[PDB]
A paper describes a structure:
We prepared a construct comprising the Eco β2 domain including βi4 inserted within it (Eco β residues 152–443, hereafter called Eco β2-βi4). After reductive methylation, the protein formed crystals that diffracted X-rays to 1.6 Å-resolution. As expected, the Eco β2 (Eco β residues 151–224 and 344–445) and the Thermus β2 (Taq or Tth β residues 138–325) domains have similar overall structures. The βi4 domain is inserted at the surface of the β2 domain distal to the connection with the RNAP. A 3-residue segment of Taq β (Taq β 212–214) is replaced by the 119-residue Eco βi4. The Eco βi4 folds into a compact, cylinder-shaped domain about 22 Å in diameter and about 50 Å in length. The compact domain is connected to the β2 domain by two short connector loops (Eco β 225–226 and 337–345). The βi4 domain packs against β2, resulting in the burial of a modest 618 Å2 of surface area. As predicted, the Eco βi4 includes two tandem BBM2 motifs. Moreover, the solvent-exposed surface of βi4, including the entire surface facing the DNA, is highly acidic (front view), except for a “neutral patch” that arises from three conserved residues, Eco β R268, R272, and R275 (top view).
RNA in all cellular organisms is synthesized by a complex molecular machine, the DNA-dependent RNA polymerase (RNAP). In bacteria, the catalytically competent core RNAP (subunit composition α2ββ'ω) has a molecular mass of ∼400 kDa. The Eco and Thermus β and β' subunits harbor large sequence insertions (>40 amino acids) that are not present in the other species and are not shared across bacterial species.
Numbering used by the authors: 151 to 160, 170 to 443
Write the structure that this text describes.
Amino acid sequence: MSPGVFFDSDVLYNARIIPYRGSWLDFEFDPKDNLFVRIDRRRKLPATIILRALNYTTEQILDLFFEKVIFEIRDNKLQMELVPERLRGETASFDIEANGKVYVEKGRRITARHIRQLEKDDVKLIEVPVEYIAGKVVAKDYIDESTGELICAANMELSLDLLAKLSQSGHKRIETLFTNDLDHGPYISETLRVDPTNDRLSALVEIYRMMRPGEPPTREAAESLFENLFFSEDRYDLSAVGRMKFNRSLLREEIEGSGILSKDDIIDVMKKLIDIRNGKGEVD
Protein backbone atom coordinates (compact mmCIF):
# COMPACT_ATOMS: atom_id res chain seq x y z
CA MET A 1 0.00 0.00 0.00
CA SER A 2 1.31 3.45 -0.99
CA PRO A 3 1.90 5.90 1.87
CA GLY A 4 -0.32 8.96 2.35
CA VAL A 5 -3.74 9.90 3.72
CA PHE A 6 -7.09 8.76 2.37
CA PHE A 7 -10.69 9.85 2.94
CA ASP A 8 -13.30 7.36 1.77
CA SER A 9 -16.67 5.87 2.72
CA ASP A 10 -18.64 2.63 2.52
CA VAL A 11 -23.04 6.39 4.45
CA LEU A 12 -20.16 5.80 6.91
CA TYR A 13 -17.15 8.04 6.29
CA ASN A 14 -13.55 7.15 7.14
CA ALA A 15 -9.97 8.37 7.03
CA ARG A 16 -6.70 6.44 6.97
CA ILE A 17 -3.03 7.33 7.32
CA ILE A 18 -0.67 4.75 5.80
CA PRO A 19 3.03 5.25 6.55
CA TYR A 20 6.07 3.78 4.82
CA ARG A 21 7.12 2.26 8.17
CA GLY A 22 4.99 1.82 11.27
CA SER A 23 1.40 1.47 12.39
CA TRP A 24 -1.59 2.49 10.33
CA LEU A 25 -3.97 5.03 11.84
CA ASP A 26 -7.67 4.74 10.88
CA PHE A 27 -10.66 6.87 11.84
CA GLU A 28 -14.27 5.93 11.05
CA PHE A 29 -17.86 6.81 11.94
CA ASP A 30 -20.32 4.19 13.17
CA PRO A 31 -24.07 4.32 12.31
CA LYS A 32 -24.79 6.40 15.46
CA ASP A 33 -22.28 9.07 14.24
CA ASN A 34 -19.74 8.30 16.98
CA LEU A 35 -16.11 8.44 15.87
CA PHE A 36 -13.61 5.60 16.35
CA VAL A 37 -9.88 5.15 15.87
CA ARG A 38 -7.88 2.03 14.96
CA ILE A 39 -4.17 1.78 15.67
CA ASP A 40 -2.31 -0.84 13.59
CA ARG A 41 -5.69 -2.04 12.18
CA ARG A 42 -6.66 -3.28 15.67
CA ARG A 43 -10.08 -2.99 17.35
CA LYS A 44 -12.04 0.28 17.24
CA LEU A 45 -11.59 2.63 20.21
CA PRO A 46 -13.73 5.79 20.64
CA ALA A 47 -11.52 8.33 18.83
CA THR A 48 -11.11 10.87 21.62
CA ILE A 49 -8.73 8.41 23.34
CA ILE A 50 -5.93 9.48 20.98
CA LEU A 51 -6.48 13.18 21.85
CA ARG A 52 -6.41 12.42 25.57
CA ALA A 53 -3.17 10.48 24.97
CA LEU A 54 -1.79 13.59 23.25
CA ASN A 55 -2.52 15.57 26.41
CA TYR A 56 -5.77 17.31 25.59
CA THR A 57 -8.30 17.69 28.43
CA THR A 58 -12.03 17.19 27.81
CA GLU A 59 -12.42 21.00 27.78
CA GLN A 60 -9.65 21.41 25.21
CA ILE A 61 -11.14 18.63 23.06
CA LEU A 62 -14.51 20.39 23.07
CA ASP A 63 -12.84 23.71 22.17
CA LEU A 64 -11.04 22.12 19.17
CA PHE A 65 -14.29 20.80 17.71
CA PHE A 66 -17.08 23.23 18.73
CA GLU A 67 -18.14 26.86 18.78
CA LYS A 68 -19.78 28.06 22.00
CA VAL A 69 -23.18 29.42 23.02
CA ILE A 70 -22.67 31.67 26.06
CA PHE A 71 -25.43 32.23 28.61
CA GLU A 72 -25.52 34.94 31.27
CA ILE A 73 -27.18 34.77 34.69
CA ARG A 74 -28.19 38.21 35.98
CA ASP A 75 -31.23 39.97 37.52
CA ASN A 76 -32.18 36.40 38.51
CA LYS A 77 -33.12 35.96 34.80
CA LEU A 78 -31.28 34.06 32.05
CA GLN A 79 -29.87 35.56 28.87
CA MET A 80 -28.07 34.24 25.83
CA GLU A 81 -25.32 35.97 23.89
CA LEU A 82 -27.00 35.87 20.48
CA VAL A 83 -25.46 35.17 17.09
CA PRO A 84 -28.56 35.64 14.91
CA GLU A 85 -27.33 33.24 12.17
CA ARG A 86 -27.76 30.39 14.65
CA LEU A 87 -31.57 30.87 14.58
CA ARG A 88 -31.83 30.12 10.84
CA GLY A 89 -34.35 27.38 9.97
CA GLU A 90 -36.02 27.35 13.40
CA THR A 91 -39.37 28.33 14.92
CA ALA A 92 -39.25 30.61 17.98
CA SER A 93 -39.93 28.72 21.24
CA PHE A 94 -40.11 31.99 23.19
CA ASP A 95 -40.52 35.68 22.37
CA ILE A 96 -37.21 36.80 20.89
CA GLU A 97 -36.87 40.37 22.14
CA ALA A 98 -34.43 43.12 23.05
CA ASN A 99 -34.57 46.80 24.04
CA GLY A 100 -38.37 46.75 24.39
CA LYS A 101 -39.01 45.23 20.94
CA VAL A 102 -40.26 41.76 20.10
CA TYR A 103 -38.36 40.71 16.96
CA VAL A 104 -39.92 37.24 16.72
CA GLU A 105 -43.09 36.19 18.56
CA LYS A 106 -43.11 32.74 20.15
CA GLY A 107 -44.30 30.24 17.57
CA ARG A 108 -43.28 32.24 14.49
CA ARG A 109 -40.88 30.67 12.02
CA ILE A 110 -37.66 32.66 12.14
CA THR A 111 -37.07 34.24 8.72
CA ALA A 112 -34.04 35.64 6.90
CA ARG A 113 -35.65 39.02 7.53
CA HIS A 114 -35.90 38.41 11.30
CA ILE A 115 -32.20 37.54 11.38
CA ARG A 116 -31.36 40.69 9.39
CA GLN A 117 -33.48 42.82 11.72
CA LEU A 118 -31.59 41.43 14.75
CA GLU A 119 -28.25 41.98 12.97
CA LYS A 120 -29.12 45.53 11.86
CA ASP A 121 -29.94 46.53 15.46
CA ASP A 122 -26.77 44.86 16.84
CA VAL A 123 -28.81 42.64 19.15
CA LYS A 124 -26.26 40.49 20.95
CA LEU A 125 -28.11 39.51 24.16
CA ILE A 126 -31.68 38.17 24.63
CA GLU A 127 -33.64 36.67 27.50
CA VAL A 128 -34.27 32.91 27.35
CA PRO A 129 -36.31 30.49 29.46
CA VAL A 130 -34.60 27.98 31.75
CA GLU A 131 -35.97 25.09 29.65
CA TYR A 132 -34.07 26.35 26.59
CA ILE A 133 -30.72 26.14 28.41
CA ALA A 134 -31.61 22.76 29.97
CA GLY A 135 -31.28 21.21 26.49
CA LYS A 136 -27.63 22.19 26.25
CA VAL A 137 -24.25 20.58 26.86
CA VAL A 138 -21.87 22.48 29.16
CA ALA A 139 -18.42 23.16 27.66
CA LYS A 140 -16.31 23.29 30.86
CA ASP A 141 -16.18 22.21 34.47
CA TYR A 142 -17.78 24.55 37.01
CA ILE A 143 -17.10 24.60 40.76
CA ASP A 144 -18.91 26.59 43.41
CA GLU A 145 -16.12 29.12 43.88
CA SER A 146 -17.01 29.62 47.58
CA THR A 147 -17.23 25.98 48.67
CA GLY A 148 -14.82 24.69 45.99
CA GLU A 149 -17.08 21.73 45.23
CA LEU A 150 -17.78 20.65 41.64
CA ILE A 151 -21.23 21.52 40.27
CA CYS A 152 -20.81 20.02 36.81
CA ALA A 153 -18.13 18.59 34.52
CA ALA A 154 -17.35 19.43 30.92
CA ASN A 155 -19.61 17.72 28.38
CA MET A 156 -22.42 17.11 30.87
CA GLU A 157 -25.95 17.66 29.67
CA LEU A 158 -27.57 20.48 31.67
CA SER A 159 -30.76 19.96 33.67
CA LEU A 160 -33.15 21.96 35.86
CA ASP A 161 -31.17 20.82 38.91
CA LEU A 162 -27.76 21.79 37.49
CA LEU A 163 -29.11 25.14 36.28
CA ALA A 164 -30.50 25.82 39.77
CA LYS A 165 -27.13 24.88 41.30
CA LEU A 166 -25.15 27.03 38.85
CA SER A 167 -27.42 30.01 39.57
CA GLN A 168 -27.31 29.42 43.35
CA SER A 169 -23.49 29.26 43.34
CA GLY A 170 -23.07 32.83 42.02
CA HIS A 171 -21.91 31.97 38.50
CA LYS A 172 -22.83 34.63 35.93
CA ARG A 173 -21.55 32.94 32.72
CA ILE A 174 -22.29 29.44 31.42
CA GLU A 175 -20.48 28.21 28.33
CA THR A 176 -22.22 25.53 26.22
CA LEU A 177 -21.61 23.76 22.89
CA PHE A 178 -23.11 25.06 19.66
CA THR A 179 -24.46 22.03 17.78
CA ASN A 180 -27.26 21.15 15.38
CA ASP A 181 -28.58 18.12 13.51
CA LEU A 182 -27.05 19.10 10.13
CA ASP A 183 -23.79 20.93 9.57
CA HIS A 184 -22.55 21.24 13.13
CA GLY A 185 -23.23 17.73 14.45
CA PRO A 186 -22.32 16.76 18.05
CA TYR A 187 -20.13 13.76 17.03
CA ILE A 188 -17.14 14.54 19.24
CA SER A 189 -19.32 15.30 22.29
CA GLU A 190 -21.15 11.99 21.87
CA THR A 191 -17.84 10.20 21.26
CA LEU A 192 -16.54 11.45 24.63
CA ARG A 193 -19.52 9.66 26.24
CA VAL A 194 -18.66 6.22 24.83
CA ASP A 195 -14.91 6.79 25.44
CA PRO A 196 -14.26 4.93 28.74
CA THR A 197 -11.01 6.84 29.34
CA ASN A 198 -11.04 10.06 31.37
CA ASP A 199 -7.51 11.52 31.18
CA ARG A 200 -4.12 11.19 29.52
CA LEU A 201 -2.90 8.38 31.78
CA SER A 202 -6.06 6.27 31.47
CA ALA A 203 -5.94 6.81 27.68
CA LEU A 204 -2.26 5.69 27.55
CA VAL A 205 -3.05 2.65 29.72
CA GLU A 206 -5.99 1.66 27.49
CA ILE A 207 -3.87 1.97 24.35
CA TYR A 208 -1.14 -0.12 26.01
CA ARG A 209 -3.62 -2.86 27.07
CA MET A 210 -4.91 -3.03 23.51
CA MET A 211 -1.42 -3.36 21.98
CA ARG A 212 -0.01 -5.61 24.72
CA PRO A 213 -2.68 -7.54 26.51
CA GLY A 214 -1.95 -9.13 29.83
CA GLU A 215 0.54 -7.13 31.73
CA PRO A 216 -0.74 -3.83 33.27
CA PRO A 217 1.74 -1.20 32.32
CA THR A 218 3.77 1.24 34.32
CA ARG A 219 3.22 4.92 33.50
CA GLU A 220 6.63 4.95 31.82
CA ALA A 221 5.87 1.89 29.68
CA ALA A 222 2.50 3.31 28.54
CA GLU A 223 4.01 6.71 27.66
CA SER A 224 6.94 5.11 25.82
CA LEU A 225 4.76 2.78 23.74
CA PHE A 226 2.55 5.69 22.61
CA GLU A 227 5.51 7.95 21.70
CA ASN A 228 6.91 5.14 19.57
CA LEU A 229 3.63 4.51 17.72
CA PHE A 230 3.66 7.73 15.63
CA PHE A 231 6.16 10.18 17.17
CA SER A 232 9.60 8.56 16.82
CA GLU A 233 11.09 8.15 13.34
CA ASP A 234 13.00 4.99 14.27
CA ARG A 235 9.55 3.30 14.62
CA TYR A 236 7.31 5.42 12.35
CA ASP A 237 8.09 7.13 9.08
CA LEU A 238 5.74 8.60 6.34
CA SER A 239 8.66 8.64 3.88
CA ALA A 240 9.20 11.83 2.05
CA VAL A 241 6.74 10.86 -0.55
CA GLY A 242 4.21 10.05 2.20
CA ARG A 243 4.64 13.43 3.85
CA MET A 244 4.27 15.10 0.42
CA LYS A 245 0.96 13.35 -0.26
CA PHE A 246 -0.28 13.94 3.27
CA ASN A 247 0.48 17.66 3.08
CA ARG A 248 -1.22 18.12 -0.30
CA SER A 249 -4.36 16.37 0.99
CA LEU A 250 -4.54 18.52 4.14
CA LEU A 251 -3.69 21.74 2.19
CA ARG A 252 -0.30 22.42 3.73
CA GLU A 253 1.70 25.04 1.80
CA GLU A 254 4.89 22.91 1.79
CA ILE A 255 5.45 19.28 0.80
CA GLU A 256 8.60 19.10 2.93
CA GLY A 257 8.09 17.99 6.52
CA SER A 258 8.79 15.29 9.07
CA GLY A 259 8.46 11.52 8.76
CA ILE A 260 6.69 11.39 12.14
CA LEU A 261 3.17 12.66 12.85
CA SER A 262 2.38 15.76 14.86
CA LYS A 263 -0.69 16.24 17.03
CA ASP A 264 -1.77 18.81 14.44
CA ASP A 265 -1.54 16.18 11.67
CA ILE A 266 -3.86 13.91 13.66
CA ILE A 267 -6.30 16.69 14.64
CA ASP A 268 -6.38 18.00 11.04
CA VAL A 269 -7.32 14.56 9.68
CA MET A 270 -10.08 14.25 12.30
CA LYS A 271 -11.31 17.77 11.43
CA LYS A 272 -11.40 16.98 7.71
CA LEU A 273 -13.26 13.73 8.32
CA ILE A 274 -15.80 15.59 10.48
CA ASP A 275 -16.15 18.30 7.81
CA ILE A 276 -16.99 15.58 5.25
CA ARG A 277 -19.69 14.16 7.56
CA ASN A 278 -21.05 17.70 8.20
CA GLY A 279 -21.28 18.11 4.41
CA LYS A 280 -18.52 20.70 3.88
CA GLY A 281 -16.32 19.11 1.21
CA GLU A 282 -16.24 15.49 0.04
CA VAL A 283 -14.22 12.25 0.07
CA ASP A 284 -11.28 11.70 -2.33
